[PDB]
Design a protein around this ligand. Structure first.
Ligand SMILES: *C(=O)N1C[C@H](NOS(=O)(=O)O)CC[C@H]1C(=O)NOCCN
Ligand SMILES: *C(=O)N1C[C@H](NOS(=O)(=O)O)CC[C@H]1C(=O)NOCCN
Ligand SMILES: [Cl-]
Ligand SMILES: [Cl-]
Ligand SMILES: [Cl-]
Lengths: 241, 236
């Protein structure tokens, strides 16, 4: 009989076309079956980098560190490399522009004790916050695989995480990336030395496709490949036109 | 002092180009200033038609007639003219395809007493539900102007309507029409005999522009509105 995770190695052509390697993991919610080009890499755990903004947002909201998605967090005045960071942000734009210093302040206000407790409740990756509370997802001990990202995202989609429904709805709003008459994408990118991420889902009229992809990234060039390669897989599988 | 409301008649060119006439009303949330090509028409009251799906959704959710955005409303098996209506729906797709029979069923379950009480609490238009409980927004006594649509939508945006915050968040999710790196549009279209509507808002990084347009009478509703938004440098 059929397997929970089916391997489709033909997607490697989309990584090969761009002289890269990685994994795309898809989960068809209606069919309760998953698909990936590399079963092994689907289960390899990596630093989450900026994809950690999803659980960080949930915890910050549930504890009231963030009151709502409209609350303004003033620029601390320090000019950083990414120009979109040097301005005031709310939760919506802090996600969209992946504004690390805003999220570092969230993490410091959450604190290590509550951060560890929440990640355990979320069953998130290896749950290891060793390092600094404001950088463990960038250079500390936490590791999460693409399949673990799917499991976490499915809980979020269904409001099943151990935080309020409100917190989950707000974060899903903040994840909005693209919407048209054909589909809605809610997702979060990430990048740390040598690995780029894109995780999220595609909402259709009568199904949801969760996705988690990571790929080798020798430099910061080709960050757009994260979405481009994923979309090539989504197009091949007739999920988007 | 400055004017809360300014008239810009140059937008009439966008209507005239299509041999039509109408009004676009814009509200700059940050500045607390509004703009329209026709001050009089901006404040004249019309049947809301399918733009009434916004308050109808809020009421159905708040009262528990609709449990959440996943609850399925089964097709009743009657083949109707709009093909996308001839299938099962949830709140998201019922809004998206403007599925009338689903919303007539909501209205019957809400009932006249609860519908009237909710519209009064919402300050919604003339608050008058006279007519059929399941069609008064298309052929009954209720009327609302474009500026009144904006006042209602601003309350919804800020979670200030009397219904639960949850209901307001769910409906705002169901209003999602378009999103990209430049803007998010949450809106609802409508058409009554001789009037087309598009009402909603454009979310930018650090401002929100509310809009309500109506025009004498379908893709022109969005196209004309977008020409105004482009002229005002709101969208690219
Ligand atoms: C997280 O992955 N970040 C923050 C930002 N995200 O951009 S995205 O890859 O387009 O999501 C830039 C990349 C990455 C970092 O490099 N963060 O570490 C820098 C800490 N200031
Ligand atoms: C509401 O305005 N409706 C339902 C449907 N909405 O489509 S939209 O204008 O694209 O949002 C079609 C038009 C309108 C009607 O109910 N029209 O049918 C009138 C016959 N009772
Ligand atoms: Cl981050
Ligand atoms: Cl309707
Ligand atoms: Cl949304």
């Amino acid at each position: 009989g059929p397997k929970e995770w089916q391997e489709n190695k033909s997607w490697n052509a989309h990584f090969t076309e761009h002289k890269s390697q990685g994994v795309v993991v898809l989960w068809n919610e209606n069919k309760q079956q998953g698909f990936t080009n590399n079963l092994k890499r689907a289960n390899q755990a990596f630093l989450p980098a900026s994809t950690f903004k999803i659980p960080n947002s949930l915890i910050a909201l549930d504890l009231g560190v963030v009151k709502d998605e409209h609350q303004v967090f003033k620029w601390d005045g320090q000019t950083r490399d990414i120009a979109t960071w040097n301005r005031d942000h709310n939760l919506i734009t802090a996600m969209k522009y992946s504004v690390v210093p805003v999220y570092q302040e969230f993490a410091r206000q959450i604190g290590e004790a509550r951060m560890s407790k929440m990640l355990h409740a979320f069953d998130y990756g290896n749950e290891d916050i060793s390092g600094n509370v404001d950088s463990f997802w960038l250079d500390g001990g936490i590791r999460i695989s693409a399949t673990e990202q799917i499991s976490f995202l499915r809980k979020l989609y269904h409001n099943k995480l151990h935080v309020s429904e409100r917190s989950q709805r707000i974060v899903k709003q903040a994840m909005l990336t693209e919407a048209n008459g054909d589909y809605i994408i809610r997702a979060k990118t990430g990048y740390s030395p040598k690995i780029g991420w894109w995780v999220g889902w595609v909402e259709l009229d009568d199904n949801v496709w969760f996705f988690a992809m990571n790929m080798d990234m020798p430099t910061s060039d080709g960050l757009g490949l994260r979405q481009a390669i994923t979309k090539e897989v989504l197009k091949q599988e007739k999920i988007i036109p």
